[PDB]
Design a protein around this nucleic acid. Structure first.
Lengths: 210, 135, 198
RNA sequence: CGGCCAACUACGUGCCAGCAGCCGCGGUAAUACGUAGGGUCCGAGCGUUGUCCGGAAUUACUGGGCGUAAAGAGCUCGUAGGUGGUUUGUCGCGUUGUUCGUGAAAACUCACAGCUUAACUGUGGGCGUGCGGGCGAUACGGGCAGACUAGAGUACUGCAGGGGAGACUGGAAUUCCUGGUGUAGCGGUGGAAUGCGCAGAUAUCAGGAGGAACACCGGUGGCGAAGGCGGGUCUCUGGGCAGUAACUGACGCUGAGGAGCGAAAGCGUGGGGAGCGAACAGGAUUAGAUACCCUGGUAGUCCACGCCGUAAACGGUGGGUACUAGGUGUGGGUUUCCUUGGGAUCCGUGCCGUAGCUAACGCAUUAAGUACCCCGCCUGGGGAGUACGGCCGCAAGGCUAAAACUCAAAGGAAUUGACGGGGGCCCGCACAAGCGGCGGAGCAUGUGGAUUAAUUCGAUGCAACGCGAAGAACCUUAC
RNA sequence: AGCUCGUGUCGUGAGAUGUUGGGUUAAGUCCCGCAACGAGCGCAACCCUUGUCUCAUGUUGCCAGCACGUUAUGGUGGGGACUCGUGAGAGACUGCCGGGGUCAACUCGGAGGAAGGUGGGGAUGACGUCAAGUCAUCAUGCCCCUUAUGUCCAGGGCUUCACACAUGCUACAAUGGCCGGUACAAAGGGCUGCGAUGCCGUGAGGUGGAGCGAAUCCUUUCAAAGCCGGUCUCAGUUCGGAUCGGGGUCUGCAACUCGACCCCGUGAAGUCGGAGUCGCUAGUAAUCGCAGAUCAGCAACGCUGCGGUGAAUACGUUCCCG
């Protein structure tokens, strides 16, 4: 319908960096398999925690798993108790040893993935969806410094039978411009009536910064 | 040059064009011309060209005025209806084909002659300067 | 208009002066056919006013319901309208017409209550009246009966204004019962006002 | 315990069983069906059905309407009726003031008393909106008796006009006829064919007959009450307008029923019959034309004498009257000024435009504006301007005019779209200009269908069918 | 090439206006007007590749000027000159001149230049449509199975066939077939992989392992159509290869149902294809090979790419289609 390519996959050569970074000849399928099982292992407890980014640098078979989140304090509970448990399970599930770096984003309302987190987690919690969309926005535009704001919510909105898509915005979100620095995040709400897939586009600025 | 529809009743939008015109002239005293692409420089030459050639008085206004002086109530009908709508009194020149009920404090006369019209402009401009002297 | 009860840890709800009385009369989704389907928008007929007897009439167009209500609030805010009274009644029987809206607004003795249909009941409950007797003849609508009621309140005038138009010393303009009601209403204005000063 | 309309959740059946006052709820996640919890509203009751008033300004006296929504008789003349300019007098019938009589009791309303309270009952007022008698008033309506000239009508001087009827006559054109000249086609169409020709057509020239219609002037123009009216001339006759004010002195307006006029088609009797032409043939088109298009063609169209009475008889706007900014055309006529030009005026007919009005479009001194007088007419859509009955008619038919029943609408104006074998302007291998193919042959793949124990499952206009498969011997793999 | 919104105005209202008008554009591109003034998502631009040069640049790549090879060639000492490889940079902007333009946008010609006017091609799909597709990629609400609708294995099927459609490939021959000699690519692929010289076969291939995780080694120094030569003489043929028989090789536990390839024979339909219909406007069409992914093997004539040789025509919007 809207045949819109994932813009983090449309600027992954130009502005947005890769999330996983190594070099691999004849070891690549194994590094893919470990990358997948690591991201499944970091889905659940960190999606409780407020995860945004999961980068995996990979040096000579050590591993370096780095996570950008919005609360160091739920990811790091008691020191080593909440960190070294998921870290140690990453050390056992992989056949390797894990150096887990955990870091905070300076503004959670600035990331499109975390905006999709807070919106969809509100939308599972029986709030008004137009009220939710408005809440995430306006406040986000000011927060740090955003130029774009696109929030599309499809699915059983309000528990209705029809799957109505909604489309709210503010400012400038140019997708066809490649010097855009757009963050994109889709996260899917889980109501009892079903799943409300939320897409958030956030246009930070014109800046190439090449 | 041309009466833009909605200057008085809509001041909150046409004031933004003025601050953009200030940022344009303040980036003309800056001197950034060669560092940008010349299509954008000629485009800002069109923005300063049209926006300065068509907007000269509200550059000094800022302040949603208390009185409006109108030449030719017939042709500039938009200014007289907008000026009536806010409650601002209307001072005008009225030929034989102008409705005097829309103008509170008229000065009747021909507007087609530059001597007569321009002389009445001298009347009320000297009147405003006479207001400025004792203030 | 749902999910309004909320507590926010944000900057401000911006509650401030002019706590006026605001009534939303009707909302009908307004559709528009375009190429490939229908575009639903929303109209909210907003009545605002204070209990003195100043009335607004606003008409909100937006594709969200509280957005249309807020735009009707700002539009009636832009356009107020003074209604003359006697005590908390109306002066004299009028009929207003807004092109099909007929409304008869007749005064009554106090204590009777605002008897009117829901649009006229909205415009009169926001206003400074408590005891009048109206009826909405024709047009069976909300917009035309609100706008017809406001035209009916434009056909109102003071007893004093009438005396002034005719250059006659009051007494000589009213009859006497209505002058006595002026004495009663200004007397209770004096009692509640001087209880307001202390 | 959807919405109105105070009051919601689960289970059970999933276009069934049922619900419902209307809108409408039931197609395996119903707050609308059935049961449960729970809530709401009433309470010795609470729901249903029926009948009436209300809401219904929806028969509108108070208190509605008629350009297009239902609704202005086709148009006039006029009987009863309704309505009436200016002014003096008189009567006191309408109107009004006041007093008397009466409007039984009960009820109703106000106060009070009585029953433990209340309903209930009683006492005393008011109500009894009216009617009759006496006395008073005279502005307004009316009656009578008068007076007036602005409305109305008449006389006089002009003026414009397809107003009407009768009579006589004019030319161009079409058709036929006789006679020339003269040959093989003419006619007709989107393209053709029936058709007329080769026996002398069409073509052209001369003459003759006969009928009808009036080119140009001639149009947003004139006249008529409306239909309607244009070759000319003559005869008879109708209305209008202006000017003077000579006369009469309110004689005005409207008009239920009523009489008269009333396009076209049609009807009767008698004429006439060129062109056009229903019906009626043939031809063509087409699936099929009982149609459009073609060739022929009778009633009719024409005149005389009568019928009939209908129309989008339309300005979709009844008639009269007074008033309410203007601007510009054109038709008829009077006058002041420049000296034909403008001014002013009375009557007419158009275009634009304020105020005001209207649902909107629009109207807007030629009102759909502001008011008065009289008439017609409307009361949801169908059923139906139909039946029954009567009246008129030679007939066709017209006029007058229902009910059962049924529907939850049928309508008016404007808005956004889509659409058009509507208009304009544009583009694309869209056509044209080319080149190479597919459709026929053999095979390779995929699908339909039929098979099968199984032929796993999906994808069927463009946008499914060398597609999910970037690899079916076993594995894959679902059968 | 459009789709909207904010604020103002217009309207009782749905709504309008803006976004219509005059001109211009590949384009709501852009100017000039106009009760509108602005913004936003699109269009353009930013990015990749192709076209020219400059600077940097020397092995595994080039070889001019040098030296040495003799057999076989940059083969080897050597060299930055030419390529080429990949980094940075310049360069196309109606910038420069002539004419139309309302002295505005823009359009017709000229110069310079490798390139001229979005140079060529990509990547890039606005608001929405179609209850389009997919509960079999995955995730999933609800309903169903739980002694089977789970799961394990052998065998079979997904390949059946009187048919009908659809996309392709090989053809119907002389611009051709067959034999001999000979010249020129681009890109790619490679670990329990790619596998050379040599030897055994007619040939699939066998034996063997040089050498390479690869600008080096291997895919031969890479092609085929091309060119030179000979033969065939218009024919159901020296065209055409379907089919069928015999004989093999390789992969795999296993080629029966059901693999590909080679050898010998066999030698059918088919003589340019009715109604119709499809693709394509320049390195395009047409034709010629090459590589890749999937993969032990292959139904590959498929798909994705790479290069070779290379045309015709466009008068122009009447007609069909959007």
């Amino acid at each position: 319908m809207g045949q819109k390519i994932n813009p983090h996959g449309f600027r992954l050569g130009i502005t947005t960096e890769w999330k996983s970074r190594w070099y691999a000849d004849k070891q690549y399928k194994d590094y893919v398999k470990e990358d997948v099982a690591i991201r499944k292992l970091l889905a659940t407890g960190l999606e409780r925690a407020g995860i945004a980014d999961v980068e995996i640098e990979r040096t000579r078979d050590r591993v370096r798993v780095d996570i950008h989140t919005a609360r160091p304090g739920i990811v790091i509970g008691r020191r080593g108790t909440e960190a070294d448990r998921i870290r140690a399970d990453l050390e056992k599930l992989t056949g390797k040893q894990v150096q887990l770096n955990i870091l905070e984003v300076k503004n959670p309302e600035s990331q499109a993935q975390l905006v999709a987190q807070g919106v969809a987690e509100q939308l599972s919690n029986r709030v008004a969806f137009r009220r939710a969309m408005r809440k995430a926005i306006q406040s986000a535009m000011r927060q740090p410094n955003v130029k774009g704001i696109r929030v599309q919510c499809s699915g059983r909105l309000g528990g209705a039978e029809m799957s109505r898509s909604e489309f709210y915005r503010e400012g400038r979100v140019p997708l066809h411009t490649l010097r855009a620095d757009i963050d994109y995040g889709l996260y899917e709400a889980k109501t009892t009536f079903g799943r409300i897939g939320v897409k958030v586009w956030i246009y930070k600025g014109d800046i190439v910064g090449g | 040059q041309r009466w833009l529809g909605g200057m008085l009743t809509n001041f909150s939008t046409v004031h933004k064009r003025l601050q953009r015109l200030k940022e344009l002239e303040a980036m003309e005293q800056t001197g950034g011309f060669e560092g940008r692409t010349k299509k954008e420089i000629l485009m800002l030459t069109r923005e300063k060209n049209k926006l300065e050639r068509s907007l000269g008085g509200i550059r000094d206004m800022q302040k949603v005025p208390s009185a409006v002086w109108v030449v030719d109530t017939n042709k500039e009908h938009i200014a007289v209806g907008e000026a009536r709508k806010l409650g601002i009194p209307v001072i005008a020149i009225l030929d034989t084909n102008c409705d005097p009920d829309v103008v509170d404090y008229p000065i009747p006369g021909n507007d087609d002659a530059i001597r007569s019209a321009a002389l009445l402009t001298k009347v009320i401009a000297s009147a405003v300067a006479e207001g400025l002297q004792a203030r | 208009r749902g999910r309004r009860d909320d507590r926010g840890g944000r900057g401000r709800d911006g509650g401030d002066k002019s706590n006026y009385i605001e009534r939303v009369v009707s909302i009908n989704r307004v559709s528009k056919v375009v190429k490939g389907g229908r575009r639903f928008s929303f109209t909210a007929l907003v009545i605002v006013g204070d209990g003195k007897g100043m009335v607004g009439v606003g008409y909100g167009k937006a594709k969200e319901v509280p957005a249309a209500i807020a735009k009707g609030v700002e539009e009636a805010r832009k356009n107020f309208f003074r209604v003359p009274l006697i005590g908390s009644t109306i002066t004299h029987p009028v009929q207003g017409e807004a092109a099909a809206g007929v409304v008869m607004l007749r005064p009554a003795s106090p204590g009777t209550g605002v008897i009117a249909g829901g649009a006229a009941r909205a415009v009169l409950e926001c206003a400074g009246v408590h005891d009048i007797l109206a009826k909405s003849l024709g047009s069976d609508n909300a917009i035309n009966v609100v706008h017809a009621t406001v035209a009916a309140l434009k056909l109102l005038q003071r007893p004093e204004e009438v005396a002034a138009r005719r250059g006659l010393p009051i007494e000589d303009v009213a009859p006497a019962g209505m002058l006595k009601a002026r004495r009663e209403s200004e007397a209770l204005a004096a009692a509640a006002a001087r209880e307001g000063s202390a």
